[PDB]
Every structure is written in C-alpha cells, then in structure tokens.
Amino acid sequence: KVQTDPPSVPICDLYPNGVFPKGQECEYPPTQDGRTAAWRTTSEEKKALDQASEEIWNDFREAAEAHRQVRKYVMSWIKPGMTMIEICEKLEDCSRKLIKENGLNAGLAFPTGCSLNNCAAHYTPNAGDTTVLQYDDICKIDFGTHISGRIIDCAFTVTFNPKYDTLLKAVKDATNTGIKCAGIDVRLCDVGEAIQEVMESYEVEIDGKTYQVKPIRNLNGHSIGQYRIHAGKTVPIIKGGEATRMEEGEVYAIETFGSTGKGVVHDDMECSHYMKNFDVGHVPIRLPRTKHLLNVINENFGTLAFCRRWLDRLGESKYLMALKNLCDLGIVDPYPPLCDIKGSYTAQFEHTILLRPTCKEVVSRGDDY
Numbered sequence: 001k002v003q004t005d006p007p008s009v010p011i012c013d014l015y016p017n018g019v020f021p022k023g024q025e026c027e028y029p030p031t032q033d034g035r036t037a038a039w040r041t042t043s044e045e046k047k048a049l050d051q052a053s054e055e056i057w058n059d060f061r062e063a064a065e066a067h068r069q070v071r072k073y074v075m076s077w078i079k080p081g082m083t084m085i086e087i088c089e090k091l092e093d094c095s096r097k098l099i100k101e102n103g104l105n106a107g108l109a110f111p112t113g114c115s116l117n118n119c120a121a122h123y124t125p126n127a128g129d130t131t132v133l134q135y136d137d138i139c140k141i142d143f144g145t146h147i148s149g150r151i152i153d154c155a156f157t158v159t160f161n162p163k164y165d166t167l168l169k170a171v172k173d174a175t176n177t178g179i180k181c182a183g184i185d186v187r188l189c190d191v192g193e194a195i196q197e198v199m200e201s202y203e204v205e206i207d208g209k210t211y212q213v214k215p216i217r218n219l220n221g222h223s224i225g226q227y228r229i230h231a232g233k234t235v236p237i238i239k240g241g242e243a244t245r246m247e248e249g250e251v252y253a254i255e256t257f258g259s260t261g262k263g264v265v266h267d268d269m270e271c272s273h274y275m276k277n278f279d280v281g282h283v284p285i286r287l288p289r290t291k292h293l294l295n296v297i298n299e300n301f302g303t304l305a306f307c308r309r310w311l312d313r314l315g316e317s318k319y320l321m322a323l324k325n326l327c328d329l330g331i332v333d334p335y336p337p338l339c340d341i342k343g344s345y346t347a348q349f350e351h352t353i354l355l356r357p358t359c360k361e362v363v364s365r366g367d368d369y
C-alpha cells in the first residue's frame with residue numbers, strides 16, 4: 001500500500017482504485033485578442049470530450065507516476081565510478097517492476113538513454129561497453145514507460161560538478177518555456193522561437209571559457225502516438241516551423257537540448273538503438289536468422305524502440321547480421337547516438353504533455369522537475 005525504500009511495489013498496486021494521479025494542469029496560453037482559455041476549463045462540450053478519453057489520460061498517468069518514482073530513485077544512487085551498464089540495468093530493473101511489465105501492455109517505451117558530454121541523445125551501452133561515469137560528465141538520463149502504448153517520454157540531466165549548473169538551468173528553463181508556450185492552435189514554429197530566445201539569453205562559464213547556450217538546431221520535440229514514439233509533428237527548438245499547429249487531443253514530448261559546441265548533432269559511436277518502422281507492412285522472410293529475429297522484435301517490441309542489450313537479455317545471440325538485414329530491408333531503422341563537436345557539452349530536459357480539451361496537462365511533471 002506504500003512504496004518501499006528501494007522501489008519494488010508496482011504503481012499499479014499503489015492506486016488500487018485504478019485512478020492515477022494527474023500531472024500539472026495548466027490553462028491554455030491566450031492568443032492575439034487575449035483569447036483566454038478559461039472557457040475550456042469547464043465548458044460543457046470539452047468536459048464531455050475530456051472525460052471521454054479518461055481511460056487514456058489515466059494510462060499516461062500510470063506511466064508518468066512510474067517515471068517519477070523511478071528517476072527519483074536513480075538520482076539517489078547515480079554516481080561516478082559506476083559503469084554505464086550498471087546504471088542502465090539498475091534503472092531498468094526498477095522501471096520494469098513499478099510499471100509491472102506485461103508484454104506489450106506495460107513496459108519500457110524505449111531504451112535508457114544516458115548520453116555523455118558532447119553526445120546529446122540516443123546512447124545506451126551495448127554489451128562490453130566499459131565506459132565509466134566520471135565526476136566531470138554531463139549525463140542525460142532519458143528513459144520512458146508506457147501502459148497500453150501510452151508513452152511517457154521524459155528526461156533530465158545529471159552532473160556532479162557545479163560548473164554546469166547554469167548550463168542545466170538554461171536548458172531546464174528553455175524546456176519549461178516551450179511547455180508553457182505549447183497549446184491547442186499554437187504554431188510549432190512559435191514554440192521554437194520562444195525556446196530559443198530563452199535558451200540563448202543564458203551565458204555560461206565552464207573551465208575559463210564563456211559560451212552563450214545554443215539550442216541543438218537539428219534536434220527537437222515531437223508529437224506522440226500509441227506505440228509510436230514520434231507521431232509525425234516535430235517541435236522546432238529554433239526559428240523555422242514546418243507548417244503546423246498543435247491540435248486538441250494530441251500528445252507532445254517537449255524537450256530542449258543546450259550545447260556549447262556547434263549546436264548541431266551527428267551520428268557517432270556504435271549504434272545501440274533500433275526501432276521497427278511504424279509504416280512498413282508485413283514482410284515474408286525465409287532467411288532463418290533474420291526471420292527469427294524479426295519475430296522476436298514483433299513479439300517483444302512491436303513498434304517500440306529497443307536496444308542490443310534487450311536482445312541479449314532475451315537469450316538472443318549472433319544476431320547482428322540478421323539485425324543488419326532487417327535494417328537494409330528497411331523493416332527496422334537504426335538510431336545511432338547524436339553527438340555535437342568533440343569537447344562540447346550538452347544538456348537536456350523533457351516532459352510529455354497532454355493537450356486535453358479542458359486543459360494542458362504536464363503529466364510527467366514532478367517535484368524534481
């Protein structure tokens with residue numbers, strides 16, 4: 001009925017009523033004519049529309065509470081000296097128990113990202129990686145939980161040297177600025193500019209050098225779909241703006257990345273992230289190993305991202321060639337680590353928000369961030 005010191009009680013059994021805690025509920029940002037959004041807070045039409053998709057919002061909440069309790073636990077023990085593998089496996093072991101992993105009904109939405117320093121995202125260790133977290137490392141812990149495909153994409157940055165404090169704040173503030181600015185009928189490009197003005201209004205000093213924080217321009221937030229980490233709409237972070245507005249009922253992952261490098265990422269290091277193309281249909285495979293591996297992917301991950309380690313834990317061996325095949329066949333897409341120029345530092349803060357009819361909910365919000 002109460003969580004245990006080292007979290008072990010599933011969020012499930014903590015809220016027996018089946019109703020999970022809501023995130024930070026915000027009133028939608030006004031528009032031109034000071035168009036207030038307090039009319040939706042209790043409109044009759046909207047309230048019916050909201051309570052209409054209540055079971056969904058409730059699932060996002062179960063996952064969010066899982067994310068909150070897991071990360072609270074990670075910040076209490078993540079320390080330099082631990083290998084990236086020890087960290088990810090310890091984090092993922094907790095994440096599996098609190099979300100009560102159940103096939104594709106409940107589990108980890110994507111691999112535990114823990115990109116270091118100049119690398120901003122999509123780095124998680126593969127078997128054999130001997131990398132050890134250092135006192136001067138700036139590590140982005142980015143992991144996700146999901147219930148019935150309702151994905152909670154949320155992340156924070158970890159450091160131990162106070163010299164990055166102002167860099168993390170610059171980015172944490174940039175993220176909240178995009179969260180506050182986001183809303184139904186809000187144009188993506190606008191959320192982007194907002195995020196940039198703030199991000200760039202910060203200047204930091206790290207090891208004698210001064211820098212004006214730069215948003216990683218080729219990185220960004222994005223909309224979320226059931227069992228689909230990236231639904232289709234992207235959230236800028238800079239000045240351009242695709243050509244779109246956020247819509248009622250949508251779900252977005254508002255994330256920003258700040259850097260001292262060139263503010264641009266590129267594929268680097270060995271790949272560990274892979275995900276089945278949400279669009280590709282059923283492809284008959286006769287090649288044994290490739291056929292088997294794909295079956296494992298469909299059974300265990302569906303359209304959710306996974307990593308080599310997760311193939312390992314399932315007892316799969318000698319699967320790289322077969323994984324390459326799936327990749328060359330375009331059935332699976334590789335998602336290599338995205339890093340900025342060597343020597344640069346990058347920070348990241350991310351939250352999942354629900355654009356509900358009556359309000360904007362920052363479901364993954366917590367005491368920490």
Ligand SMILES: CCc1ccc(NS(=O)(=O)c2ccc(F)cc2)c(C(=O)O)c1C
Pocket residue numbers: 110120121122153219220221222229230234253273274275305335338
């Ligand atoms: C590796 C699976 C994956 C695919 C697409 C996106 N979304 S994205 O393409 O908008 C993206 C890519 C890199 C990044 F750093 C942020 C967002 C993400 C993600 O939300 O990070 C993941 C984990």
Ligand SMILES: [Mn+2]
Pocket residue numbers: 142143153154155255350
């Ligand atoms: Mn993320």
Ligand SMILES: [Mn+2]
Pocket residue numbers: 153221222253255350
């Ligand atoms: Mn994301």
